Design a protein around this nucleic acid. Structure first.
Lengths: 516, 416, 452, 314
RNA sequence: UAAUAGAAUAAGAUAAG
RNA sequence: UUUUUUUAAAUAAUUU
């Protein structure tokens, strides 16, 4: 209920009869977000008028995040709003602060523009000597976030920052290190000198400094393993009381650098699994992958981590179903309960999985015994038949192999998969084989299809080994290939190893030697 | 009688003729003063008074075009010259933005109205397109109509030579900084009259033949219809100035017409010059390299191939001996000339090499010292390798300078 | 659908587009996709370049013009962030911007053309065909880019790195651009040779059509195509037989031993021919010039049954072909004239004049058709050639049309092109007919130009 | 013909050829036995027949649909990147390529989505059928008005049928929809109650329009076309301004005196007029009723692709 | 007063100069 | 099946 004064104020706001500045709009939006007694967000005709006032106002007076917050509170109510792009300063307006403000607005409001970034860099080149030590780090961070390709300017900024080592603090050093590590084209000399700087002041580091340094080392790669060494020893005296996410980053770094000292890896993993219950979904997934890649998943290890991942398995992200399915395989441990809920979750989100994720899930579930007696095989067969148009050669191979291994019988899907794979030729035998496995289930195909399949097979027979020769011969005889060239090529390949028709030679091989 | 409304593009004379004559005389006096200079302040005073007179005349014309139905009653040649003057006075900075837009909007409206009737001849479409796109005035319907009408090649079959040359020159001069969206339609102007140029191949003069060829090649166009146009030039070398021979070499190289027999004449004509420059030397080196790669060691004349390589090498020596007179503006010219010399095993006297390596030293020193002002790291590595190959005794300063440039890291990378 | 992120919206829109264009044009999917895309915005969310390109392409594919909000947002993204459009998503953006004809679309197309020209040496088998097809959609004249792409295609084809689908896409894209390169097409034909059995009937006919359209004037490969297709006639569909007729009418060389088999196969499938196939076969026989009444009778009898299926293009081509051969079918001509009068506004610039001239050449006058096409003629005068204007004027005079509102546009057009109007010898007779009806009173300046 | 593979999903050049309505705003039209939900109360019809106009009780469009429809208007007056299918309009204020403080567009239902959908909206079409004695409803044409901020002019007193003299019977209705909140200071309608039964259902003489003058005189020109008795009923019931919300619609009789106020707010104001006619509507002359349209002859029943049937109570 | 990121994927006829 | 690729090029002419 709006009394007369409130009703008239609301009407004046609705009719665009009040000249609102950016500050007043920000105050009104903050009041609406804080207290909902007046129901400001429940009046579309009032919020639309406030948005109309927002568009026709001078937004440069407020900070970039204030405009972003106004845009966010307009989006939440249902209004499509975007803060105006700031213009590049001109003539006397070029100052370091004004040029940093353009990058900050581009960051916060998500209005990235390569042309204005280049213009700002060209304007900032001559006056780079007026920057304070903090503004240089702010510029490095802003350019790192915007994914700029001007690595030369970032290298200049890094050199100027590193000239001021004494002034900078540990947090600034870590932020500069990670921002430099994120930029792709930085010369390795600057990275080496920055890592040398990071190597000293090692004990001054805080947990956030450790996280930033670990992120930088993960991005850089194995070439900086020595620096990572100085991390691990420095972390050896604080491992017993350390944050879970820091330990996850440690394990990821151990996996990336291919660390050789196993004692430290075991110590860090044993300390991690104590507090592994405090990890989020993404951190737990990354820790689970890292523990697998380091050959450290013992019975207690896998049991403890699976007990933690079952909690998130109920509402797992589609991007996380396939990894834990991969970790569940290749290990000799019982994971029936985990795989049941994972398969159920994959069933639930079958209509949003991409082609690659669906193919991956089918590939892992291909050889799983309890996956055959599930609705997932049929549902994924229909979904794959729908998504064959969006599948690349790798997705085609994965999905077809997974469906063939699961006993899924559908001649139309296999024929469509073969036709789709005929559009772009099979580079490898591993890509071509799933089509043969799928088509051999029914045992019949048009003569044109087997003729094209033989045309694809015959060149590939000059490198396949004896087991692959036997499998290819089995599939070719199942499909009913009458071409002589392919059998001649396969028999020629066989002769290389055997060189002769051994009496013990498998009866199937003698028929091949006759070149049927 | 039918109420036809077709007036010749190039009788039915309105006051627009008088206004355009006044503008023409004012522009003529201004250009005559411009020639006369070669009293700057008094000159600019007269230029200012003429500019004020022209601005008043154009304001009167715009007011008359707005208030009265003059465009409908006007002819068509007057419309063409009105468009010409409206676009030209803007480049001369004699008109403001508001008045220029107001004058051009009604010109486009009247042009579209006449297009709807169909009285737009095959020449007026080209004229309006060339004088609208080069001025970079955008109208969606006008641009789409002109672009769709430029695909009827049967209309553009009997265009006059003067019209072709004027349009080609207008498109060529303003190519340097033209907007990207204006590029494609520009090409559609050139290809519409490509056959008229091709049949007019034996009618152009030598200076304008190269102009047409450069206008077409600078718009990344090498139509087959202009194939005789190049051939005549190949058969008419020796009437070109030595500077023109470099651009002729580049054009012939881009037209797949560059063979061994023309290369000898072209390089000889280049060497007839009084003093070489970077352009002639670079073009000669590129031509020598191109003709060097066209010989097959196992073809029909495989036995004859090595003598041809020796002839190419000797005529490359002819140019290489005169490599100290020129002045290299940028490093890529040096890195191309030296690459050609090394690849073809061309012998170069030590004096020319010393001059060449001395020139680059000042440039790399500028890049290193100034550091404020684009020699990438790969170019510096190539220069170092070249200097090491020829010997470091030639330029002992450049070796230490370039080695310290690598150690410091001044030269950026190609990725950046 | 509210719970779906824009990255999922792009994927589902691509899925809908793929199902729509290939697996039948179901209007259910078209309207569902249009409704979904009409309420989407790239605002306040970080998106990949591929997602934005897919959204733009799927929006533009479904009839969404340049005034749309999503189209404007996608076009703006591409301009601001250009380097983010790698060679993987360049063809998507070019295909989306092909039909869009605006300033921003022109700028984007030019920038991507320059990008593809710079990176023509680094593409692989997929990228070259995708880029050349996307640029074949748009109308551009960057010869240098096409030459670079052709050099890359030849380099990749030397090592045998193209499938039949790649070959047909490349041939169609290069023939669409009218880029006549003898060596590029020779390499494509030799790649088809080397592929051998991997080129089926469905993938061989479009290759022959693309090779015929470019017009290389090479009799060495036309004979080879005829020999290779002579074994596949028994498998060919009616739509493939019509395309075969059209392609070997384009080639211009007479192969009786192939045309006989094609005629027998067309007679076998006479019940499956639509109006489009009949029109294509008749136009092909007109172009090649053979006069075969036996097939023509069956084609006319079939076309009499699918009159209501005839399009303006089909009506124009069928009537022109029947008029050229001097075939008299009063019932078919009456039905076609009534149908053309029904859909007179669908005629383009060439179709209207062709239909009018074909109807006027034969002694067949119908007021229903004549009034409709004469009234429609006003909107196409501005898009006609001098010879086409002469033909239209003669046909209009044969209809005895005197309305000034119709005659003024055509007389203006023929006055603006008077030199080419009076320089065509083959139409001279038509001229002395046109002025025999109208007389010197109508449009005096044209009469004075005719006298001189 | 053969629609190229990348052109299979496109739409006709002009949206007149689109038989039916696209699903963009409200999805698809309901089934034949599902059109009874949008019926209006008989008191609304009685109020329309008594006052000469009526405001429908419920807003016809959701706020998101109004936002999209206003975006269509904003893109129909670009003046920089001119609208595609601009040639598919009967008239435009930007034909001079300059525009002004008032933007008016006609026949926009053939140019943009949503506007083509708005014609087939059941909520207004069922009410128009009820107003037209339960007959077939045919679109007459569309109109879009957009008045700029602080300078938008006002349209003086006028009668709609005074512009439709080439149609023989009075069998028309106007539906005006506010795409923005309106008031006496920004484009509100000003109608004269009971003005459709003054001159025995006749047409008042046209008013004198002198631009570049204050709004008060423009709205005070009423006292020059009325007679003494009409002066008396104007004294008894003065003109009344109707305040409209972001989606509220208003039915207006063709013979009702009607004007629109000026715009004195800080933002532009938009509105959409849609004219509907019944089945038994004829022409009076030989020729087209609208620019570049199908031409009729004598008393020919008005039908064709340019006047689609949007509702049929059978 | 307000800042955290994951995916790598190919459809194919315009009555020409 | 063996054709060919790698410049910063800027000199036309006009009353439109």
């Amino acid at each position: 209920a709006r009394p007369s004064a409130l009703h008239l104020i609301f009407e004046r706001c609705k009719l665009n009869l009040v000249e609102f500045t950016a500050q007043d709009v920000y105050q009104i939006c903050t009041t609406a977000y804080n207290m909902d007694t007046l129901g400001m967000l429940q009046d579309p005709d009032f919020m639309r008028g406030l948005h109309d006032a927002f568009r026709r106002s001078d937004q440069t007076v407020i900070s970039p995040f204030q405009a972003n917050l106004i845009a966010d509170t307009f989006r939440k109510v249902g209004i499509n709003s975007m803060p105006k792009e700031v213009s590049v300063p001109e003539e006397d307006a070029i100052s370091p602060e004004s040029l940093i403000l353009v990058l900050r607005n581009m960051n916060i409001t998500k209005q990235r523009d390569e042309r204005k970034i280049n213009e700002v860099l060209k304007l900032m080149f001559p006056i780079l000597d007026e920057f304070s030590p903090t503004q240089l780090s702010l510029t490095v961070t802003e350019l790192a976030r915007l994914k700029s390709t001007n690595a030369d300017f970032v290298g200049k900024l890094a050199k100027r920052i590193m000239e001021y080592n004494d002034d900078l603090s540990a947090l600034d050093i870590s932020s500069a290190a990670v921002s430099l590590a994120y930029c792709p084209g930085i010369s390795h000399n600057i990275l080496y000198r920055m890592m040398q700087i990071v190597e000293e002041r090692m004990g001054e580091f805080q947990p956030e400094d450790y996280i930033n340094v670990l992120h930088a080392l993960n991005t850089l790669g194995p070439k900086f393993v020595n620096t990572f060494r100085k991390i691990v020893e420095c972390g050896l005296q604080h491992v017993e009381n350390m944050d879970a996410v820091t330990l996850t980053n440690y394990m990821v770094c151990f996996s990336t650098m291919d660390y050789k000292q196993r004692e430290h890896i075991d110590i860090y993993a044993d300390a991690l699994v104590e507090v592994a219950t405090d990890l989020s979904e993404k951190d737990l997934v990354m820790a689970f992958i890292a523990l697998q890649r380091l050959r450290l998943l013992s019975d207690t290890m896998f049991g403890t981590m699976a007990s933690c991942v079952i909690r998130y398995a109920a509402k797992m992200d589609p991007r996380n179903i396939a990894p834990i399915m991969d970790i569940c395989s290749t290990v000799p441990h019982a994971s029936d309960h985990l795989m049941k809920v994972l398969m159920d979750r994959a069933v639930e989100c079958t209509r949003i999985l991409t082609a690659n994720q669906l193919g991956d899930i089918l590939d892992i579930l291909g050889l799983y015994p309890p996956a055959r007696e599930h609705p997932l095989v049929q549902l994924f067969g229909k979904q794959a038949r729908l998504r064959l148009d969006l599948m690349g050669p790798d997705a085609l191979a994965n999905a077809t192999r997974g469906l063939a291994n699961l006993g899924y019988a559908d001649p139309e899907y296999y024929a469509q998969a073969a036709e789709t794979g005929f559009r772009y030729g099979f580079k490898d035998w591993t890509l071509l084989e799933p089509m043969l496995m799928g088509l051999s289930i029914t045992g019949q195909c048009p003569p044109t299809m087997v003729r094209v399949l033989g045309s694809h097979i015959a060149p590939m027979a000059r490198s396949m080994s004896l087991m692959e020769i036997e499998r290819a011969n089995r599939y070719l005889r199942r499909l009913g290939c009458e071409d002589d060239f392919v059998y001649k090529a396969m028999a020629s390949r066989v002769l290389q190893f055997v060189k002769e028709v051994t009496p013990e030679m498998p009866e199937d091989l003698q028929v091949l030697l006759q070149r049927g | 009688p039918l109420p036809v409304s077709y007036s010749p593009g190039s009788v039915t004379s309105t006051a627009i003729t008088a206004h355009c004559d006044v503008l023409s005389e004012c522009v003529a006096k201004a250009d005559e003063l411009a020639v006369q200079l070669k009293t700057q302040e008094g000159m600019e005073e007269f230029v200012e008074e003429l500019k004020t007179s022209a601005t008043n005349e154009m304001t009167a014309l715009v007011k008359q075009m707005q208030t009265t139905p003059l465009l409908q009653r006007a002819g068509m040649h007057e419309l063409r010259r009105t468009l010409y003057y409206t676009t030209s006075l803007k480049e001369r900075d004699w008109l403001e933005e508001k008045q220029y837009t107001a004058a051009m909007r009604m010109l486009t409206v009247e042009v579209l109205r006449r297009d709807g009737d169909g009285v737009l001849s095959a020449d007026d479409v080209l004229y309006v397109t060339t004088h609208v796109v080069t001025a970079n005035f955008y109208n969606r319907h006008l641009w789409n109509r002109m672009e769709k009408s430029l695909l009827k090649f049967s209309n553009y079959e009997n265009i006059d030579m003067s019209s072709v040359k004027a349009f080609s020159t207008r498109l060529f001069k303003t190519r340097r900084g033209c907007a990207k969206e204006t590029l494609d339609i520009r090409r559609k102007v050139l290809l519409a009259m490509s056959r008229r140029v091709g049949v007019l191949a034996n009618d152009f003069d030598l200076p304008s033949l190269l102009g047409v060829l450069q206008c077409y090649t600078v718009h990344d166009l090498t139509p087959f219809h202009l194939e005789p146009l190049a051939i005549r030039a190949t058969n008419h070398v020796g009437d070109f100035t030595p500077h023109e021979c470099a651009t002729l070499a580049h054009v012939l190289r881009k037209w797949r017409t560059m063979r061994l027999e023309v290369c000898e004449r072209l390089v000889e004509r280049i060497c007839t010059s009084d003093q070489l420059t970077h352009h002639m030397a670079n073009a000669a080196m590129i031509a020598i390299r191109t003709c060097f790669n066209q010989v097959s060691d196992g073809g029909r004349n495989a036995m004859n191939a090595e003598p041809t390589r020796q002839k190419l090498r000797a005529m490359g020596e002819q140019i290489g001996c005169r490599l100290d007179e020129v002045e290299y503006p940028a490093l890529p010219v040096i890195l191309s000339i030296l690459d050609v010399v090394v690849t073809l095993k061309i012998y170069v006297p030590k004096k020319c090499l010393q001059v060449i390596f001395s020139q680059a030293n000042d440039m790399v020193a500028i890049v290193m010292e100034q550091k404020d002002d684009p020699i990438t790291a790969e170019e510096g590595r190539q220069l170092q390798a070249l200097l090491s190959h020829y010997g470091n005794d030639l330029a002992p300063e450049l070796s230490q300078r370039m080695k310290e440039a690598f150690r410091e890291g001044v030269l950026p990378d190609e990725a950046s | 659908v509210s719970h779906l992120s824009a990255r999922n919206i792009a994927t589902e829109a691509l899925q809908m587009k793929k199902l729509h264009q290939e697996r039948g044009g179901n209007p259910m999917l078209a309207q569902q996709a249009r409704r979904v895309l009409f309420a989407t915005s790239i605002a306040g969310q970080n998106l990949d370049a591929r997602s934005v390109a897919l959204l733009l392409n799927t929006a533009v594919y479904f009839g969404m013009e340049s005034d749309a909000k999503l189209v404007r947002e996608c076009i703006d993204y591409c301009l601001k962030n250009d380097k983010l459009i790698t060679v993987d998503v360049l063809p998507i953006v070019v295909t989306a911007c092909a039909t869009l004809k605006s300033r921003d679309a022109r700028e984007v197309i030019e920038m991507q053309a320059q990008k593809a020209a710079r990176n023509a040496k680094f593409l692989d088998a997929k990228d070259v065909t995708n880029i050349i097809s996307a640029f074949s959609k748009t109308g551009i004249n960057h010869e240098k880019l096409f030459a670079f792409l052709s050099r890359r295609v030849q380099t990749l084809a030397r090592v045998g790195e193209f499938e039949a689908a790649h070959l047909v896409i490349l041939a169609n894209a290069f023939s669409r651009l009218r880029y006549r390169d003898k060596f590029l097409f020779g390499a494509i034909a030799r790649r088809a040779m080397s592929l051998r059995e991997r080129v089926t009937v469905n993938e061989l006919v479009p290759l022959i059509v693309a090779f015929s359209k470019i017009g290389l004037k090479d009799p060495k490969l036309s004979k080879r195509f005829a020999t290779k297709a002579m074994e596949y006639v028994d498998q060919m569909n009616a739509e493939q037989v019509a395309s075969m007729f059209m392609a070997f009418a384009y080639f211009g060389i007479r192969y009786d031993q192939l045309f006989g088999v094609l005629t027998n196969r067309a007679v076998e499938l006479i019940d499956e021919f639509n109006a489009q196939y009949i029109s294509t076969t008749l136009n092909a026989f007109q172009r090649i010039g053979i006069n075969n009444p036996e097939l023509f009778d069956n084609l006319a009898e079939r076309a009499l049954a699918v009159v209501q299926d005839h399009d303006a293009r089909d009506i124009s081509k069928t009537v022109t072909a029947l008029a050229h051969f001097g075939l008299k079918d009063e019932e078919l001509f009456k039905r076609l004239a009534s149908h053309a009068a029904s859909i007179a506004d669908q005629f383009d610039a060439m179709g209207l004049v062709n239909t009018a001239h074909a109807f006027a050449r034969t002694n067949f006058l119908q007021q229903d058709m004549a009034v409709a096409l004469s009234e429609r003629s006003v909107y196409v005068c501005r898009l006609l050639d001098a010879g086409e204007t002469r033909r239209l004027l003669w046909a209009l005079a044969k209809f005895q049309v005197r309305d000034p509102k119709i005659l003024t546009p055509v007389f203006n057009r023929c006055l603006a092109l008077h030199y080419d109007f009076f320089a065509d010898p083959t139409g001279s007779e038509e001229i002395e007919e046109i002025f025999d009806f109208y007389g010197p009173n109508f449009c005096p300046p044209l009469y004075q130009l005719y006298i001189s | 013909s053969y629609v190229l593979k990348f052109l299979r999903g496109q739409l006709p050049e002009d949206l007149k050829d689109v038989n039916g309505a696209l699903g963009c705003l409200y999805g698809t039209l309901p089934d034949v036995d599902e059109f009874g939900q949008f019926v209006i109360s008989p008191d609304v019809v009685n109020s329309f027949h008594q006052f000469g106009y009526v405001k429908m009780p419920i807003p016809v469009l959701d706020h998101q649909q109004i936002d999209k429809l206003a975006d269509e208007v904003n893109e129909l007056a670009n003046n920089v990147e001119h609208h595609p299918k601009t040639e598919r309009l009967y008239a435009t204020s930007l034909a001079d390529l300059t525009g002004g403080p008032l933007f008016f567009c006609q026949g926009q239902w053939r140019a943009a989505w949503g506007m083509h959908d708005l014609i087939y909206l059941p909520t207004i079409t069922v009410a128009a059928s009820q107003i037209l004695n339960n007959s077939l409803v045919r679109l007459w044409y569309d109109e879009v008005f957009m008045k700029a901020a602080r300078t938008g002019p006002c349209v003086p007193w006028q009668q709609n049928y005074a512009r439709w003299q080439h149609t023989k019977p009075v069998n028309h209705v106007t539906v005006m929809i506010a795409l923005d909140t309106m008031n006496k200071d920004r484009g509100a309608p000003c109608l004269v109650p009971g003005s459709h039964r003054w001159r025995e259902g006749g047409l008042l003489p046209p008013v004198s329009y002198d631009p570049t003058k204050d709004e008060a005189h423009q709205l005070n020109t009423i006292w020059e076309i009325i007679n003494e008795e009409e002066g008396e009923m104007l004294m008894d019931t003065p003109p009344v301004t109707v305040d409209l919300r972001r989606g509220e619609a208003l039915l207006i009789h063709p013979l009702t005196l009607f004007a629109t106020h000026g715009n004195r707010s800080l933002d532009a104001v938009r509105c959409c007029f849609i004219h509907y006619m019944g089945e038994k509507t004829y022409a009076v002359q030989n020729g087209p009723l609208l620019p570049h349209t199908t031409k009729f002859q004598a008393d020919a029943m008005i039908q064709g692709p340019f006047y689609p049937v949007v509702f049929d109570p059978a």
